[PDB]
Amino acid sequence: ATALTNLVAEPFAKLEQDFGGSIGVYAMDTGSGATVSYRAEERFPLCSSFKGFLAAAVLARSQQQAGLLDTPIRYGKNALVPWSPISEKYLTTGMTVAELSAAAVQYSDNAAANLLLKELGGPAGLTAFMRSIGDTTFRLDRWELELNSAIPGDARDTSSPRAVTESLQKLTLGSALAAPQRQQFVDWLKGNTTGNHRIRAAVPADWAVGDKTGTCGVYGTANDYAVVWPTGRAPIVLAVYTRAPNKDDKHSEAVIAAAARLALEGLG
């Protein structure tokens, strides 16, 4: 007999009542194949969380373009937008593709992400990479900062928790990328600095976690996805996304962490 998904769902529903919005969750245990799924196929805005997949797409390109990662991109002030703490620091010099990738992943640097999008042929180039690995859900249409608008009903710049988790599994654990590139993505995710109050807050400190966060700043819309390696066990991949119906609904990192905890604990 299969899981009683209504019982697995109940505490997510309770969480979203106090939150005042919708929570989307997908978690997969790569050892047992067990899953937890709650609104897992609903669309939620990506916000900054596209930057993880961006770095993977850049790593894919590097497989066919030797020394791409160590190539400096030297930019003018038009590259710059707010929430770009690393790229602003190197305006007078430039940054390598690898430095930009690390910055986008680990500091959620906006301008760095736009610079790397340009390398891939824009938002459509990243979406095309995601289609190449069998993600039919992911769509990035716009650039920083417009992609954060998170307007209710807009499908642009969204994915689902399930598609996010599936794609993350393929890229970090599966062989979608070559081994050095796969390990480079995992290392960038593991060094994220912005996720300490989200999925990481739900995971014992001694277990390795790599993650990427998103915070649109409107419509209670924020997220995190991660790979989690419990010591001596098969890794877990999971995604937690929120949204809410009013522009001024607050996002909550506490809700994200609680949803992560519920998801991780529900896995068979």
Ligand SMILES: [Cl-]
């Ligand atoms: Cl310029």
